[PDB]
């Protein structure tokens, strides 16, 4: 690329993999959202929480793709694997699975940052710090707070209703 | 009728029967509403939910009557049978009875649509699709969601109070 | 499902397949969009045209998923296959590939409509007519108009620039 | 300096050199701008593009000088070498020379960042990341996009006119 | 002091001690607040309640310091002892500890008032009456009300959630 400067092939590849991970996370949250919209589950606040996350994760992938082009890297897409479950159980099960998912994304961001540092690519490092690392820490804190409240509430049915009504 | 065109006697009769079914559904919801306004039941959100449905069902009947005249059919009214119960039990019992009622109305709409298709009466078919079929599907989904939440809540007294306060 | 009425397993399955097709179309347009954002392609109007389509196709998938739940069907997700190309050539090549893609989606909608009619499922039929069939016809007309203008313009470089500047 | 803390003489010197490079880049863009304002060149959008860059590069130098003082370093100025050309040829030639210039500035920023990291000077590192590195990547992407469009357009005279009229 | 009038050394010393007690109370509430912000505690209304009290107690200390200077006394600061606990248990435990703390501050205010009366220092007496005594009585009443509601609620987990959601 005429513009490409200080952008390693290793980082270019890792950014494409991270795009895949973000899109897959978006897909998982799409599945979570619509599961809570089932007439036999029917927790609308929970559905909204996960649909909003689907949107955030898609947006993250697009920001990565924009950056890939800004640096003169080449976007390469792979299949998006279907989410790991078809039914997501209780709000508690779902929030546990969400925190597992976010910790995996966070670890991928930290791995990519370490790669960037090793490659002396400060634009990449700052990009991740400025748009992704703090967002992940904030989101994981919120999920952890939600998990704690869900657990203190679970008369499990009543607790699930009240969390959806009064927190979400 | 000077205006009557492509409007079969079979559809004309079925529309009059459907008017009766809608008015009877309105009457049933009127009874449901005032039952929840009893001082010994006293669930105002539930009363409001059913009174609003009484109004929607009356409006549906009037839309059918307007259409009957637009097509040159002749409105014929029959007795409105009193609702099937004098007392409606718990919110859960009432929501189950509501969903039974709406599924019967939906089935009548689907039967009338099939009749219309068989009679090659596309204005009738579109009329039902445009004003009734989606409204019924949306309403049945909402009732199903409500039933699920009511069931998860039932300390049955506390659950009935909380559903009325926080959902309705 | 407590709410499920007149909703065949065949339609339920076909709706899940159509969701997959819409999401895959969204993914393809995401790839098309970012290809035109490459510094060595650099046709921003073209990038915007396809990114807007990625959004429309995602929205279509979500509308289908909402409907699946409204009817008491169960959303089931499959892998999203990566787009058919990694690089999309000229605007002309890309618009040809877009029209191929939209005609395939349109044909799937028409197949699902025929299935719905065969199953006497008028809510499904109306749903597709009301939210998808006319949108596809309008979009295919616009793409065809664009293809014609692109072809009349191709001094191919100058023509590609002018179409992007003055049409898109 | 009473305030100086963790600020190496090596970084202090490199910041003064970078100030010189930014001012020289401003001067080069001043020359580019006025060349495109010649009555026998007369591409006003091109003139405006480079005059705006002259301003951005001056501003960058002033931000560096402000930082030098904030850290207790001492600004030292050297001669500003005249730009490398007196006449800049076509818009294409000029945009190529601009991208060469920006890549040299970017490399100097990356060298200074590496120096900062080696000297464990995180304020310097963040300063460059926050005000300079992303601005350079964005600008180089825009120039690369412009170069691609210019190249696709070059009936070279007509292409140069159209790029100036419709892009700049 | 040129301005000092009717201001005993005993009151001057007692005001400095009360400043210390108010700052220590602020510190204790800072600790309480951040404990309820832990991801494994996660009661945000409780966190906010105590952080607001940290602010009120700091403000009280500053008002005392302002008064010390207005009277020509000399502010003298001592170490601020760390709060008595590192973890504060349940909301109930925390509210009990808060009421213990406020009763100790109230008693110190009453002791200082008695000292003022004994020293015939009416400005001091009025100062405490006008800015501190009624505020303490109001705050202790509110805490007592909160304690009663917390106790009536403790399904202890559900009760703690509901108090935080609906009272705080
Ligand atoms: C709301 C309502 C209920 C029963 C019968 C009639 C005519 C009506 O308007
Ligand atoms: C989940 C998903 C996959 C591909 C493209 C988009 C826009 C999307 O939301
Ligand atoms: C809010 C607070 C707590 C402890 C110590 C100080 C000085 C303070 O302002």
Swiss-Prot record, chains A, B, C, D, E:
Record: residues binding Fe cation:
52, 55-56, 59, 62
Indicate where this protein is primarily found: cytoplasm
Q: Where is this region: Catalytic site for iron oxidation?
A: 52-59
The terms under GO molecular function for this entry are: ferric iron binding; ferrous iron binding; iron ion binding
Per UniProt, the keywords (alphabetical) are: Acetylation, Cytoplasm, Cytoplasmic vesicle, Iron, Iron storage, Lysosome, Metal-binding
Q: From the Swiss-Prot or TrEMBL record, state where the protein is found.
A: Cytoplasmic vesicle, Autophagosome; Cytoplasm; Autolysosome
Q: Which domain of life is it from?
A: Eukaryota
Per the record, its GO cellular-component terms are: autolysosome; autophagosome; cytoplasm; cytoplasmic vesicle; ferritin complex
Instruction: Kindly state a single biological-process term from the GO annotations of this entry.
Output: intracellular iron ion homeostasis
For this protein, the record's InterPro entries field holds: Ferritin, Ferritin-like, Ferritin-like_diiron, Ferritin-like_SF, Ferritin_CS, Ferritin_DPS_dom
Q: Name one Pfam family in it.
A: Ferritin
Ferritin-like diiron domain location, by residue? 5-154
What does the protein in this record do? Answer: Stores iron in a soluble, non-toxic, readily available form. Important for iron homeostasis. Iron is taken up in the ferrous form and deposited as ferric hydroxides after oxidation. Also plays a role in delivery of iron to cells. Mediates iron uptake in capsule cells of the developing kidney. Delivery to lysosomes by the cargo receptor NCOA4 for autophagic degradation and release or iron.
Assembly and partners? Oligomer of 24 subunits. There are two types of subunits: L (light) chain and H (heavy) chain. The major chain can be light or heavy, depending on the species and tissue type. The functional molecule forms a roughly spherical shell with a diameter of 12 nm and contains a central cavity into which the insoluble mineral iron core is deposited. Interacts with NCOA4.
Q: Which family does it belong to?
A: Belongs to the ferritin family.
Q: Which PANTHER family match?
A: FERRITIN (PTHR11431), FERRITIN LIGHT CHAIN (PTHR11431:SF47)
Q: What else is known?
A: In horse spleen the light chain is the major chain.
Q: What protein is this chain from?
A: Ferritin light chain
Gene responsible for this protein: FTL
């Amino acid at each position: 690329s005429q513009i490409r400067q200080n952008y390693s092939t290793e980082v270019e590849a890792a950014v494409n993999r991270l795009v895949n991970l973000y899109l897959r996370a978006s897909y998982t949250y799409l599945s979570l959202g619509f599961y809570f919209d089932r007439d036999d589950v029917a927790l609308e606040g929970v559905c909204h929480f996960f649909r909003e996350l689907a949107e955030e994760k898609r947006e993250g992938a697009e920001r990565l793709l924009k950056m890939q082009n800004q640096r003169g890297g080449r976007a390469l897409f792979q299949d998006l694997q279907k989410p790991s479950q078809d039914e997501w159980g209780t709000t508690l099960d779902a929030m546990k699975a969400a925190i597992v998912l976010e910790k995996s994304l966070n670890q991928a961001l930290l791995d990519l940052h370490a790669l960037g540092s090793a490659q002396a690519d400060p634009h990449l490092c700052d990009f991740l710090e400025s748009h992704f690392l703090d967002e992940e820490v904030k989101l994981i804190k919120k999920m952890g707070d939600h998990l704690t409240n869900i657990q203190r509430l679970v008369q499990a049915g009543l607790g699930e209703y009240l969390f959806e009504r009064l927190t979400l």
